[model samples]
Target: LPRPSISAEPGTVIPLGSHVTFVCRGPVGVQTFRLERESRSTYNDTEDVSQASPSESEARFRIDSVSEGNAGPYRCIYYKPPKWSEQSDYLELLVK
Candidate 1:
């Protein structure tokens, strides 16, 4: 089981087209970290990034263009399933 936890930087004032890299880590043996994008529409779009293990597991999400459509208070979720314990608090990016 993976001890899932995450962190981010410059949690605000994300300019349009700026590159945002998210780094995550957890207990060893995490097979894959699932990245997700949340919006006010009440649905989620997620992507599964696979790796050998937690020590080797790293994932990132990039918004090619940050516009009103790209503007979001997003969350990067680590889904370890069954034994998974915690989630990162909502990370909001203000697009300008």
Candidate 2:
């Protein structure tokens, strides 16, 4: 399985009440996108992003009005069907 990319937009150190966007880029054939917190075994966040378009290979997950609990390392995954790709590298979200 291929590994997607995970990135924090506008920097990872987010101030209280601010927001952070996590971008995930993978194969354009991805059927679904998911975000995960590395500190746990289960996912702890959600974001409704667009499906794979003709030339789109990325999706976004965001934390609005981020709190201290939102600060951590995150990973992204792409599900093409019955199988899911390898998790992306951890992208840490720091709290200010």
Candidate 3:
């Protein structure tokens, strides 16, 4: 099973009140891309990205206005019905 990969464009560290884009790439035939941010509980601020494409098994999660509360470990996963990929590597976001 091909897993997903999470990353932050233009570096991970972001400034408060600014914008940051989180990109998650999955294997071929991926139907949905899900982004999750770590919080007090297991997960928080979950965003699901879905689109139609031939080989663009990737999704860009953009934050218009970043905040201090948005700083934490982020991960992503791709799924197609009952088939779900594992979580990607953590991408730490630091809001300054």
Best by TM-score: 2
Error of 1 at 82 (Å): 5.2
Residue lDDT tens for model 3, 33-82:
77787553344233355443655467787877889878888888777667
Best by lDDT: 2
- TM-score of predicted model 1? 0.57
TM-score of each: 0.57, 0.82, 0.79
Per-residue lDDT of 37 in model 2: 85
Q: After superposition, how far is residue 17 of candidate 3 from its true place, in Å?
A: 0.4
Q: What are the runs in model 1 whose C-alpha is more than 4 Å off?
A: 1-3, 9-11, 40-57
lDDT of 1 by residue, 1-96 (tens): 434544444555667777555555554445455444566634332334545463655555455555666566555445555454465556666777
RMSD of 1: 4.1
TM-score-best of 1 and 3: 3
